[PDB]
Design a protein around this nucleic acid. Structure first.
Ligand code: SF4
Ligand SMILES: [Ca+2]
Ligand SMILES: [Ca+2]
Length: 355
DNA sequence: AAGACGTGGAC
DNA sequence: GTCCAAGTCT
């Protein structure tokens, strides 16, 4: 970027950003902990989604030390519905590491900060530049799109050769006077003007520096690979109540998909032997007798890498003794306390409507 | 590496 | 209905 007017670019970009900067709860100060929380929440989650989640999370957990001293089940419930739940398990372990090894002080050296769980190349850049003014690039989806258009990068943005190149661009053009504002400005440009479809080049403050605008190839950039079809997984789900009114739920294991979350009992059903497969599964628990009615709904629930096809079977349960872990009976009132994945919150809504 | 890992805003 | 978001794990 020898022929690039970095200083002219920075002036127009930072002048735009001051005018159009959105009022977001994590922009009210530069507390390293609060910045870190917002940036983790923001990973692969849109700003408008994150806003109410951040507001409530910081209410329950106002300080790094409050999050460290808290129980993992309360931490998980405060993320309920946001998706990619290991972010919060990672964040929770990381803040414990900071309380121990670092005296509660978020490290300001990138190598030490990046070593914390949950902190990748994007989050090192975003937290350190905002909270401490470290000139580290914060290259997210927004930035990759903007830079591939400004500088006509035609290579798949998923390659490391391309990532290293975006990083090297940011180090050349960044305003080392205010690296936090520079990083948040490039992102904000990608979010509000230089958008994935139909970018607003005519309202763009840096139109005169953009190579894709000049060549008329903006909407063809960035280069990303089309998504390949994902496996469909049939799943039978039982909503079982008893004479007293309590419902049978169970806690998922701590490894893999939707870990440590609660669900209604379920099982894979290649074919349509779900009424049978469920009865065989519930009865295999100690002193548990069960009889299920016909299904009441079937809906899909999408994950990034697979798609669940849920069928809900109501039923009733008789227990001759204590229900063995991982299972548990819960009155309908106590359900709102447990953390459920979105799929199973909908299972429950469809069962209450049916009744 | 590759693939696992959630959900919904914004068209 | 489709894309992709203020990505990271190891
Ligand atoms: S002129 Fe258009 S393509 Fe170029 S940076 Fe601005 S919005 Fe993006
Ligand atoms: Ca790291
Ligand atoms: Ca498991």
């Amino acid at each position: 970027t020898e022929r690039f007017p970095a200083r002219e670019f920075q002036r127009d970009l930072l002048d735009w950003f001051a005018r159009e900067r959105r009022d977001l709860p994590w922009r009210k100060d530069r507390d390293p902990y609060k910045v870190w929380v917002s940036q983790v929440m923001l990973q692969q989650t849109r700003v408008e989604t994150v806003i109410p989640y951040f507001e409530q999370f910081i209410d329950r957990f106002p300080t790094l030390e409050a999050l460290a001293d808290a129980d993992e089940d309360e931490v998980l419930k405060a993320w309920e519905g946001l998706g990619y739940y290991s972010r919060v398990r990672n964040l929770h372990a990381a803040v414990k590491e900071v309380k121990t090894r670092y005296g509660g002080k978020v490290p300001d050296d990138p190598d030490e900060f990046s070593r914390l769980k949950g902190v990748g190349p994007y989050t090192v850049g975003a937290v350190l530049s905002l909270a401490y003014g470290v000139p580290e690039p914060a290259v997210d989806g927004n930035v990759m799109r903007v830079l591939s258009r400004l500088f006509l990068v035609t290579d798949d943005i998923a390659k490391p050769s391309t990532r290293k190149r975006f990083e090297q661009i940011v180090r050349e053009i960044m305003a080392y006077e205010n690296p936090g504002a520079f990083n948040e400005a490039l992102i904000e440009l990608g979010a509000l003007v230089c958008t994935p479809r139909r970018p607003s080049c005519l309202l763009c403050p840096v139109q005169a520096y953009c190579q894709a605008f000049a060549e008329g190839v903006a909407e063809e950039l960035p280069v990303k690979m089309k998504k390949t079809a994902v496996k469909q997984v049939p799943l039978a789900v039982a909503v079982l109540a008893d004479d007293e009114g309590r419902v049978l739920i169970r806690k998922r294991d701590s490894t893999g998909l939707l870990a440590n979350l609660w669900e209604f009992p379920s099982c894979e059903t290649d074919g349509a032997d779900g009424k049978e497969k469920l009865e065989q599964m519930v009865g295999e628990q100690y002193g548990l007798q069960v009889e299920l009615t016909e299904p009441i709904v079937s809906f899909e629930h999408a994950f990034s890498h697979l798609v669940w096809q849920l069928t809900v079977f109501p039923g009733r349960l008789v227990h001759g003794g204590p229900v063995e872990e991982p299972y548990r009976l819960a009155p309908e009132d106590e359900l709102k306390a447990y953390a459920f994945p979105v799929s199973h919150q909908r299972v429950w809504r469809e069962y209450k409507e049916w009744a």
